[PDB]
Amino acid sequence: KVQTDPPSVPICDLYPNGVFPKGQECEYPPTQDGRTAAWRTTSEEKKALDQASEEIWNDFREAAEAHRQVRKYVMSWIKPGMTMIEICEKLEDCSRKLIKENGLNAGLAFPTGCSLNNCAAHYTPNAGDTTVLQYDDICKIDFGTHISGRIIDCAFTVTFNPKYDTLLKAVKDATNTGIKCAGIDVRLCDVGEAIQEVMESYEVEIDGKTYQVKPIRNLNGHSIGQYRIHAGKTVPIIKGGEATRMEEGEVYAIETFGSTGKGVVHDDMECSHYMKNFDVGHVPIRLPRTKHLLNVINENFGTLAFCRRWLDRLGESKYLMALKNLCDLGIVDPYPPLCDIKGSYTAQFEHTILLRPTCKEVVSRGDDY
Numbered sequence: 147k148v149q150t151d152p153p154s155v156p157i158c159d160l161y162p163n164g165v166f167p168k169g170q171e172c173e174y175p176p177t178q179d180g181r182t183a184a185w186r187t188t189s190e191e192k193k194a195l196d197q198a199s200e201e202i203w204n205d206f207r208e209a210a211e212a213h214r215q216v217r218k219y220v221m222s223w224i225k226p227g228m229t230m231i232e233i234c235e236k237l238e239d240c241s242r243k244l245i246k247e248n249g250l251n252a253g254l255a256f257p258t259g260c261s262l263n264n265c266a267a268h269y270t271p272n273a274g275d276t277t278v279l280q281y282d283d284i285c286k287i288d289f290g291t292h293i294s295g296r297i298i299d300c301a302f303t304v305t306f307n308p309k310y311d312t313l314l315k316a317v318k319d320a321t322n323t324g325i326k327c328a329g330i331d332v333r334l335c336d337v338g339e340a341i342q343e344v345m346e347s348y349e350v351e352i353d354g355k356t357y358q359v360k361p362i363r364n365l366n367g368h369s370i371g372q373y374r375i376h377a378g379k380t381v382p383i384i385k386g387g388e389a390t391r392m393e394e395g396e397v398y399a400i401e402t403f404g405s406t407g408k409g410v411v412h413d414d415m416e417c418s419h420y421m422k423n424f425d426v427g428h429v430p431i432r433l434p435r436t437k438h439l440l441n442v443i444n445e446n447f448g449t450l451a452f453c454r455r456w457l458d459r460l461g462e463s464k465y466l467m468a469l470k471n472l473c474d475l476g477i478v479d480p481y482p483p484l485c486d487i488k489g490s491y492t493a494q495f496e497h498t499i500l501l502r503p504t505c506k507e508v509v510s511r512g513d514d515y
């Protein structure tokens with residue numbers, strides 16, 4: 147029936163009918179030649195094409211509902227004083243529960259990002275990380291869930307000091323702007339131009355210093371594929387970023403990043419995130435430790451991203467060199483933390499959208515953001 151205070155009932159059991167709640171459904175934005183959408187949500191052939199992938203949309207929805215319930219839960223207890231490990235463990239414990247983890251059929255799409263301050267993304271603690279969340283920290287919670295490879299890439303920013311309020315509002319508004327501009331036949335470079343205009347319309351004051359929010363130029367949104375967090379197309383966030391168009395049936399992660407620094411990220415700190423190259427095929431390996439690790443990765447993650455903590459929990463130890471080998475062989479790719487200049491502040495907001503035949507669905511939309 148209903149769920150417990152501390153989320154523990156799988157989303158699957160909350161909807162015995164196998165039909166999960168849809169996200170925010172929107173009519174596609176007008177074009178300039180009668181190519182709007184007040185006809186799509188209406189067309190008969192479109193309703194057919196759409197209904198044809200109902201099971202797919204349904205898998206995204208089950209993953210999205212798990213995501214909404216997990217983040218609402220996280221927002222109630224995340225507090226300075228907790229270690230980053232404690233935060234990720236508690237979040238992941240709940241995510242595995244509500245998504246009813248079942249090997250590669252259902253589970254966590256990628257590691258729990260909890261990047262701090264100047265670091266914008268790809269940071270999650272490795273074993274032994276003693277980092278503690280602080281009152282003045284600006285933490286980006288970015289985690290994912292999936293059902294049959296249908297990934298929900300969604301994220302928000304956590305703060306405790308009201309001095310970052312306008313900064314968060316700026317990035318949230320920017321992301322929502324990107325979501326509204328998105329649609330079938332829309333040029334990706336136009337979405338980025340739109341996002342940047344809104345983002346830069348915000349000026350903020352933090353600790354006596356004023357800044358015009360800058361989008362992080364080398365970070366962006368992206369299309370999503372089955373078991374493929376990045377399908378190939380990128381949603382810029384600034385301006386001149388390719389006029390390729392979005393297509394019907396595509397799924398996108400509309401994510402924007404705002405910064406008070408240079409607006410550019412670079413690799414920094416110890417790497418924790420890793421993911422098999424989607425285009426690399428079977429590779430025979432004789433090296434004992436390297437062979438075993440690759441098998442563990444194929445069995446547990448496939449082409450989904452993972453982190454060192456997830457290797458530890460599987461009972462693996464002294465796998466670092468084997469992991470480096472796979473990376474050097476190009477079988478696996480490392481994704482180190484991406485950070486702006488020291489002293490800068492970065493914020494993020496992200497949603498997954500479905501470019502359905504009849505409409506645009508912000509499947510991960512919630513009452514929170």
Ligand SMILES: CC(C)SCC[C@@H](N)[C@H](O)C(=O)NNC(=O)c1cccc(Cl)c1
Nearest residue numbers: 256257268288299375376419421451481
């Ligand atoms: C580092 C990822 C493999 S783990 C997933 C992180 C996402 N939550 C984040 O929003 C994101 O999209 N990060 N960037 C990438 O995943 C990325 C960048 C360039 C090339 C490829 Cl294949 C993936």
Ligand SMILES: [Mn+2]
Nearest residue numbers: 288299300301
């Ligand atoms: Mn993300």
Ligand SMILES: [Mn+2]
Nearest residue numbers: 299399401496
């Ligand atoms: Mn993303």
